Amino acid sequence: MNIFEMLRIDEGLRLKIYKDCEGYYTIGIGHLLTKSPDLNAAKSELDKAIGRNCNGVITKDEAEKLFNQDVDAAVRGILRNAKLKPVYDSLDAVRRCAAINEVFQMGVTGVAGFTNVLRMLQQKRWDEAAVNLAKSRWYNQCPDRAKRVITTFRTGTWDAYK
Ligand SMILES: CCc1ccccc1
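# phenylethane complex -> structure
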């Protein structure tokens, strides 16, 4: 088990655009296209992502290419954020996976707002952090996308994905 297998389980796979649990346009393995409510704006983002006219249906190797890019962006997003990096670096290996996973789903800005959860996690207060994350708008709207991630933060094991 690793970050990629973890996210393949949580995000699964779609080969055509859908609205995710926050209502935004998406494809592949949790690849957010845009926050715009216009399908065609999402469609332009996709063609620009792949480098061809799709028109909205991608292959497996292309989905996996996007996935690699998005995992990388999520890690870079953490390391470049002043709120996220010190908390991230205090975390053990498995919880670092849940952190990458959270940012991958929610984006850096959304996650960076969790001021108390960030403090709780850095002070190693696993129980309280998991409770506070379970009150997030992220969790209440994307329950089974988020559930195993919150459990992972609490336990620090891979058992939720087992
Ligand atoms: C709040 C989870 C988290 C912690 C550190 C870095 C990213 C995300």
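# post-check
Strands lie at 14-19, 25-28, 31-34.
Residues 78, 84, 87-88, 99, 102-103, 111, 114, 117-118, 121 surround phenylethane (CB under 6 Å).
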